[PDB]
């Protein structure tokens, strides 16, 4: 099965998922000098005050916090989106070292980690139908750099002990994802894909310009998670990021000058 090691990592994925060599794959390098400012783009509208988190899960390739998405509780609108997208989960990608770990890069700069907040377009009724549509998902990407601790992340770091191995889950209620946002919502946006199999090209990417800072101690705890299940030989969950893919016929647009 696919993963991030030498015999099953990203360079191998195309044998089981040939869309890996597709026309609108993610992530990409954001060249800040060639991105086009578009005054037509609207500000993002993030409405997370009624979010209901349920659970945190180690899925064997990352950890993810899941939200109740049976109603319009936590939604993203605006920016380049048409319609309403509900939050279903967020997860992270990170490195074995502070100088790598993000999926997107900015002028080839890598960050220590990247947060993905995944939302699906309510017009398609459920997540499984949305991923089959070119405008089915909207993913907010936030970079993490190492510096000062992020208070709103600590609740997450504290429970990782309890979901160390693949398939472990824990109740995780009353977590407010607003504490993970930077001050500014300026963004870049381009059409792309999921960055893990099945790599479907159903995502409008919205990547925030401003990183959030986390402390070395906080990302250290990420690196203690395991890819393996309980009882299996220990393999640390690190470097679970896909490298930048060719931009091909796409335009990155910026909401700012
Ligand atoms: Zn992701």
From Swiss-Prot:
Q: Which GO terms describe its biological process?
A: angiotensin-activated signaling pathway; carbon dioxide transport; morphogenesis of an epithelium; neuron cellular homeostasis; positive regulation of cellular pH reduction; positive regulation of dipeptide transmembrane transport; positive regulation of synaptic transmission, GABAergic; regulation of chloride transport
Reactions catalysed, semicolon-separated, are: hydrogencarbonate + H(+) = CO2 + H2O; urea = cyanamide + H2O
**What outcome is documented for mutating residue 61 to W in this protein?**
Impaired activity, rescued by 4-methylimidazole (4-MI). Impaired activity, not rescued by 4-methylimidazole (4-MI)
- EC number(s) reported in the record: 4.2.1.1, 4.2.1.69
Chain sites annotated for binding Zn(2+): 91, 93, 116
- The UniProt site entry described as Involved in the binding of some activators, including histamine and L-histidine is assigned to 89
Q: Which residues carry this modification: Phosphoserine?
A: 162, 169
Cross-referenced Pfam families: Carb_anhydrase
Q: Which family does it belong to?
A: Belongs to the alpha-carbonic anhydrase family.
Other noteworthy facts? Target of drugs used in treatments against glaucoma disorder and breast cancer.
Protein known as: Carbonic anhydrase 2
Q: Which organism is it from?
A: Homo sapiens
Q: Which gene encodes it?
A: CA2
């Amino acid at each position: 099965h696919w993963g991030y090691g030498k015999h099953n990592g990203p360079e191998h994925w195309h044998k089981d998922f040939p869309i890996a060599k597709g026309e609108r794959q993610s992530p990409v390098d954001i060249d800040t000098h060639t991105a086009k400012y578009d005054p037509s783009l609207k500000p993002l509208s993030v409405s997370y005050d009624q979010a209901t988190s349920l659970r945190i899960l180690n899925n064997g390739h990352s950890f993810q916090v899941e939200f109740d998405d049976s109603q319009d509780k936590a939604v993203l609108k605006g920016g380049p989106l048409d319609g309403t997208y509900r939050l279903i989960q967020f997860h992270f990608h990170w490195g074995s070292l502070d100088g790598q770990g993000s999926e997107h890069t900015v002028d080839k700069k890598k960050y220590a980690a990247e947060l993905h907040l995944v939302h699906w377009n309510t017009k398609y009724g459920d997540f499984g139908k949305a991923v089959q549509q070119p405008d089915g998902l909207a993913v907010l990407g936030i970079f993490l750099k190492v510096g000062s601790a992020k208070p709103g992340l600590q609740k997450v770091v504290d429970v990782l002990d309890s979901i160390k191995t693949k398939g472990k889950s824990a109740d995780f209620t009353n977590f407010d994802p607003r504490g993970l946002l930077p001050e500014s919502l300026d963004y870049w946006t381009y059409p792309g894909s999921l960055t893990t199999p099945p790599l479907l090209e159903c995502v409008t990417w919205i990547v925030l310009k401003e990183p959030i800072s986390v402390s070395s101690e906080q990302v250290l705890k990420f690196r203690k998670l395991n890819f393996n299940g309980e009882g299996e030989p220990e393999e640390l969950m690190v470097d679970n990021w896909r490298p930048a893919q060719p931009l091909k016929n796409r335009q990155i647009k910026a909401s700012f000058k």
